[PDB]
Write a protein that binds this ligand. Structure first.
Ligand SMILES: Cc1c(NC(=O)NC(=O)c2ccc(Cl)cc2Cl)ccc(OCCCC(=O)O)c1C
Ligand SMILES: Cc1c(NC(=O)NC(=O)c2ccc(Cl)cc2Cl)ccc(OCCCC(=O)O)c1C
Ligand SMILES: *Cc1c(COP(=O)(O)O)cnc(C)c1O
Ligand SMILES: *Cc1c(COP(=O)(O)O)cnc(C)c1O
Lengths: 816, 816
């Protein structure tokens, strides 16, 4: 078997008896009534047993050495399953495989029983998860802090071509990886009012909610380091949530506890979109308030807070945890009694902010009346922060009255609001973009005024992905052939993949790389019929676009191409075309009407195309249901063509693109986000770039975008639009897609037509190359061998050195 | 050390390493940061490990042999802590004591960390718990079925002398004894409507709620038998509780899941009182519906249902689970398609009902409009049952038109209601009282008409208590001296306690029995200052009345006596009186105003009495806070005088009375419930009986009860009443107790004054005896030696033989 570790004689024996121990004592089952679910749990507990020893010494280590601690605050941690990832990082995979085999079980079958920890929406949440893995692997004293939602991202179901949402009860059968820590339970305050006394302000008459922490282990790759992800759960106190007497009902008071506990009930399913709901704000203050108390308690142990920034670094994943700035001030000033200026100095030096998008509708602008009611003291602090900041601006740009209102954290208008992004820049010593282009756009556009005031704050940290889960775990076959030639060191040193460049003309390697891709495609094609049922051709080109459904991601542009391919086949049926299986997957936020309309269009196209006999097996349109982390681990290694076609300037970075490049897929996309640095790394000749550049989009906006023009000059595009309008794709409901057509023609913010011609032309070139297996594979080797830069180990090493001020280390912790 | 088992060399070593295993692997802690709570859990898991082996073979045994199964349906199971009880029944107590000692820990300190499983209100729920223990010890294939409330009986707090209720979050830190079984999850239906088709009725358009079972082990006493208590948890389905589309909000739909799950949220805190709330009815159908499906699934394995009663017996603990009758019919007729008559025959033969009270306000009469909306099909079945039953009556008593309406399950009037007790008698082959007197009263009064129709159905089964928890566990000192003389066989054969009669004149025994009582009192007096703080004299007579607060229990009569004692001391200060510490404890249902007023009176009396310098240490009035199972295990072994003073004919049986008799306390009470059989067993000369007999109460009711008469002829009583009226006990609020005085004088349903004179006279006699240690102790020996009849092992053996048709067995199951 592969390099999934050694199957030692002693360790396979030990594993088996512990598997049985747990099956008996933990699951209280006996082989004759054990269900596959019991077997999965016995294995999970047996594997978990192996890292508790290390988890304890790692945490004890940090206490003795007392290094600077990194706190990663995010309202999202898109973890996925954790059994395999743990076996991988512990080098237990083969041993476990062997042991379960001897017990007469199929490890892979058991792995599929684990539920995904879908506590994220998409890119932002998966980044945090990749980051955690890298911070552990780089030996950093880091903690991931978040919310333990009992309901993660909803499970997607397609009914009659429409998306149906359903509760993700991932904790239903229990979570063997987490461990409640009811000793560090903390109180969080809401509402109340502010009393201004003789020696300071006081936050009074507040409603209390308890925050109970649950720790989940985060093992580093083969270095015996296990860090911690602490997730908070909301709990109602037993007193006031019953003790506030004078009629109401005792039963009612108890049932009403599910009101304070609703704070950690569900994740908001919005990807790159802001919904100003009170419940959201409560979740945001909740994770911040609890986390800070825990951070300060740890520090008090390790009261001059001058050294606080020297021992603490808190990273803000977007503006979601932005209340950490005025909350740190509140504690330091109101509770610790530090003077404002000393408190502010400490706050700025420990906080750092990460921006993830430039679209306006994703920007967090909280109505003042909301903050005023829920967090009265924080609003006072934000006004004071704003006051002192604007004074800094006025002093720097005398008379620039327009700049003053532009930079204010407080936005005037219909209803006053607080611009959380402005708050973050002001109270952080570093603000970074997630890709070189996005970072530049921040300085030139969105945060130009802030950049002019404090240029030193703005940085860039291109995103990355973990090679462990995103290669070794999901593509062992590819990882193995690579290791056969260059060794195993690249797993934690992805740059070494360049060495593969010298095998680009190797006849054996070219044959292998192509073989694993073929095996991956056959396995996925099988999985497709197994769990979803309705055949696909594994000899075709696997054209896949998987990511959340958005207008800026242009799944619609992908659709126009698919209809074009179909129309050309119908025109010249007996003409040869490279067979394609185009797979589009992703979830739409429940309230996003357009995004839900697009899913219906995709399935509608498949209904026509997949049953047309003239088309045969040359073209299949498949919608990948319930796209999530575990599903991504299956499609990506099987993809040939990765679709990264967002309008230039809208996708901050993207990370799925990097996942595909590492797994042997060629990329067709625009010069957007990280796509630019990928092409720049692999060479533009090894990339399928097309469409407008940022500059072209701006030029078009200056003159004005008119979709009619494109409709008028391109007969193929016109034909498609008239097909949708006449009900060609929706016979029973001819006007079903009027909203899409109407939008495309009159309010397309992402100029889909503007990139249509260059897109189908470019698609022609990829089909041409696919016709030449040898050259296609050689170009694939050029992408893989050049993907090393996109490992989160590189991203983290940069955050560590340029923002946190800590030195990464690949030193093995002193055994378990 | 005592007979808490052997401290084997091999087993103490084994216990220690497993304690450490769990402390490391399970709690993920290391000795340097382990909290006492961690130590308690490591021990709990280590002890639990010892019975899983037996639990599995016991359940596997029942499958192979396939004996008749006993199902005990109760909405209450007042279990209390379970660590010690498990060690006791497994003979692990000494080993564990030794092992934790060597690990440098105090086992007793750790035992106090366990939370009580207060899933009961009082007597009815504790009976079910004692019964479970006896059924396991007698080797019966029995299952306890109930509801897993996440909030049990509220925790009582006394504020300014008033009771304050607060949520009993007993699951907060986790329950190491239960185990979720998500494989046997079942669906339960609510609402909907009935469609009458060609081949039967159909319950349609129902709302579904899932029932998830959790199994907790019930170990028999040293026989290697471990039965199961299955408790249902309400869970919302992920579909419809989200899938019923067309606007509303996705977030809201998820948050609204806590509406279907509210069914198993909290226990109703009503003791002997009926509240017709919809939530209550839902809990009742929920536990019945789930339990029956599980019962039938087990049977289908083991379709002629003729043998159903031969393999199944379901006992109804009161009328709470009474829907089991029309629900069994529904399944058999609607689903299994059996003819009515065959279905009814089977139903009657498998069901048996237990009555627990005769007070009208405790009787379950559900409004028809409620059943009509929530369970439409069941209402139809109940009407059909009623129809056929009344036809039986008319045929037996031709022309007796008044008897017809008296016996109807349907009560006419303001709003129609369903008399659940009538339903139970009609559909059960056996109906029993819980004490000889109560059982007779059922036949002569309440169910006279039913008794005349089917005399063969009515039986008696006097309650009992388990000698394991109620002696060996709480009073090891007494258990030991008894065992020193007669051996250990009496623990599972309480009748052998009679042998102690021959030591009644033994000088050594008399000295020992008195010594353990003195040690018990010193320990309790210490515990009092430890956890509640404010001293008591251990040389005084411990006068205790602990049970739920009720008007029928007459805590008020106890109060009049206490005030009398105080008034006599104030009259003749320098006269000698036997010192007394009277302790009154118990919870009042939150909506029971009078019961809450009584708690305030008790604390008010203590405020006056406990601070009067002339009184000194001769009289202390203490209110025992948060009385519960674990607290009972502490006070009872320390009591000298047990107060069982309910008005004759109101306390069906009582069980606390039996607990006191077994632990060396003398009883002062009325000829009520089981008090009659206790005096009859010990000899009336060894009991302190007083007051009216049932007959006297009736005579008084014939002529008419006038409290003024007693007030007029007894100067001491008059003085007390004028003290309460003038504010002697409530200075700041002089009229604070007007409701109590008003009630006593004008609407006393339990004639407190009528028994006053005979009560204080009788109290004089106990004080006289207490002055003679030797004789007091000799009378105590006569009570203990004669308590054997009140063991639940005797009660169960009788249910088994006279109702269930199974033979108890004390055979050790083939080792673990
Ligand atoms: C019930 C049972 C078992 N039962 C458990 O392991 N386990 C449990 O019943 C069990 C499971 C969970 C919990 Cl919390 C408590 C218990 Cl006691 C094992 C073997 C067996 O014989 C199989 C013969 C071959 C066959 O026919 O399959 C039977 C009958
Ligand atoms: C943190 C820690 C430990 N820590 C754990 O056992 N356990 C945990 O930290 C721990 C607890 C629960 C979970 Cl879910 C996960 C972990 Cl990793 C042990 C010893 C120690 O040194 C004590 C020196 C003497 C003293 O000064 O007490 C330190 C520092
Ligand atoms: C990597 C990942 C994402 C991010 O994909 P993009 O294409 O960058 O938007 C979203 N969802 C899942 C399941 C992922 O694995
Ligand atoms: C035994 C018991 C009861 C029943 O007491 P009675 O005096 O029969 O009403 C009630 N509560 C607890 C805690 C018990 O242990």
């Amino acid at each position: 078997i592969s390099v999934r570790g050694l199957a030692g004689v002693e360790n396979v024996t030990e594993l088996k008896k512990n598997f049985n121990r747990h099956l008996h004592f933990t699951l209280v089952k006996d082989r004759n009534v054990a269900t596959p679910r019991d077997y999965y749990f016995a294995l999970a507990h047996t594997v978990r047993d192996h890292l508790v020893g290390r988890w304890i010494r790692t945490q004890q280590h940090y206490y003795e050495k007392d290094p600077k601690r990194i706190y990663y605050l995010s309202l999202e941690f898109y973890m996925g399953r954790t059994l395999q990832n743990t076996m991988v990082n512990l080098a237990l995979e083969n041993a476990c495989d062997e042991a379960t085999y001897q017990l007469g079980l199929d490890m892979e079958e058991l792995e599929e029983i684990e539920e995904d920890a879908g506590l994220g929406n998409g890119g932002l949440g998966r980044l945090a998860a990749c980051f955690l893995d890298s911070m552990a692997t780089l030996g950093l004293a880091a903690y991931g802090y978040g919310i333990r939602y009992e309901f993660g991202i909803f499970n997607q179901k397609i009914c009659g071509g429409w998306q149906m949402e359903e509760a993700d009860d991932w904790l239903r059968y229990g979570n063997p990886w987490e461990k409640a820590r009811p000793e560090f339970t903390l109180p969080v305050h809401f509402y109340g009012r502010v009393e201004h006394t003789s020696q300071g302000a006081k936050w009074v008459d507040t409603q209390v909610v308890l925050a109970m922490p649950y720790d989940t282990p985060v093992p580093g790759y083969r270095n015996n380091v296990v860090n911690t992800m602490r997730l908070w759960s909301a709990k109602a106190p037993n007193d006031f949530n019953l003790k506030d007497f004078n009629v109401g009902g005792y039963i009612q008071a108890v049932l009403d506890r599910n009101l304070a506990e609703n704070i950690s009930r569900v994740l908001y399913p919005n990807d790159n979109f802001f919904e100003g709901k009170e419940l959201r704000l409560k979740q945001e203050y909740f994770v911040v308030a609890a986390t800070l108390q825990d951070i300060i308690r740890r520090f008090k142990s390790s009261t001059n807070f001058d050294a606080f920034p020297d021992k603490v670094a808190i990273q803000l994943n977007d503006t979601h945890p932005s209340l950490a700035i005025p909350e740190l001030m509140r504690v330091l000033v109101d509770l610790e009694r530090l003077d404002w200026d000393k408190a502010w100095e400490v706050t700025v030096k420990t906080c750092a902010y990460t921006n993830h998008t430039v679209i306006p509708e994703a920007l967090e602008r909280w109505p003042v009346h909301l903050l005023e009611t829920l967090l009265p003291r924080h609003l006072q602090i934000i006004y004071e922060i704003n006051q002192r900041f604007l004074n800094r601006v006025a002093a720097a740009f005398p008379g620039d009255v327009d700049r003053l209102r532009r930079m204010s954290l407080v936005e005037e208008g219909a209803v006053k609001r607080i611009n959380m992004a402005h708050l973050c820049i002001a109270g952080s010593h570093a603000v970074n973009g997630v890709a070189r282009i996005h970072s530049e756009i921040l300085k030139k556009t969105i945060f130009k005024d802030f950049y002019e005031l404090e240029p030193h704050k703005f940085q860039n940290k291109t995103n990355g992905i973990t090679p462990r889960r995103w290669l070794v775990l999901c593509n062992p076959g590819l990882a193995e052939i690579i290791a056969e030639r260059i060794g195993e060191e690249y797993i934690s040193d992805l740059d070494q993949l360049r060495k593969l460049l010298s095998y680009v003309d190797d006849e054996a390697f070219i044959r292998d790389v192509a073989k694993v891709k073929q095996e991956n495609k056959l396995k996925f094609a099988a999985y497709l019929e197994r769990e979803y049922k309705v055949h696909i051709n594994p000899n075709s080109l696997f054209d896949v676009q998987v990511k959340r459904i958005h207008e800026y991601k242009r799944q619609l542009l992908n659709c126009l191409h698919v209809i074009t391919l179909y129309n050309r086949i119908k025109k010249e049926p007996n003409k040869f075309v490279v067979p394609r299986t185009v797979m589009i997957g992703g979830k739409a936020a429940p309230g996003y009407h357009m995004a839900k309309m697009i899913i219906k269009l995709i399935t509608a196209i498949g209904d026509v195309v997949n049953h047309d006999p003239v088309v045969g097996d040359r073209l299949r349109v498949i919608f990948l249901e319930n796209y999530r982390v575990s599903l991504a681990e299956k499609v990506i290694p099987a993809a040939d063509l990765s679709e990264q076609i967002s309008t230039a300037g809208t996708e901050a970075s993207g990370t799925g693109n990097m996942k595909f490049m590492l797994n042997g897929a060629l990329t067709i996309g625009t010069m957007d986000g990280a796509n630019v640095e990928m092409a720049e790394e692999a060479g533009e000749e090894n990339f399928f770039i097309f469409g407008m550049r940022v500059e072209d989009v701006d030029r078009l906006d200056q003159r004005g975008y008119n979709a009619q023009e494109y409709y008028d000059r391109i007969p193929e595009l016109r034909q498609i639009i008239e097909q949708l309008s006449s009900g060609f794709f929706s016979p029973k409901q001819p006007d079903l897609f009027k909203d899409i057509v109407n939008m495309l023609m009159h309010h397309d913010r992402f100029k889909v037509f503007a990139d249509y011609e260059e897109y189908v032309k470019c698609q022609e070139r990829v089909s041409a190359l696919y016709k030449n297996p040898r050259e296609w594979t050689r170009m694939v080797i050029r992408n893989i061998a050049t993907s090393g830069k996109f490992s989160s180990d590189r991203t983290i090493a940069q955050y560590a050195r340029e923002i946190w001020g800590v030195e990464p280390s690949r030193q093995r912790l002193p055994a378990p």
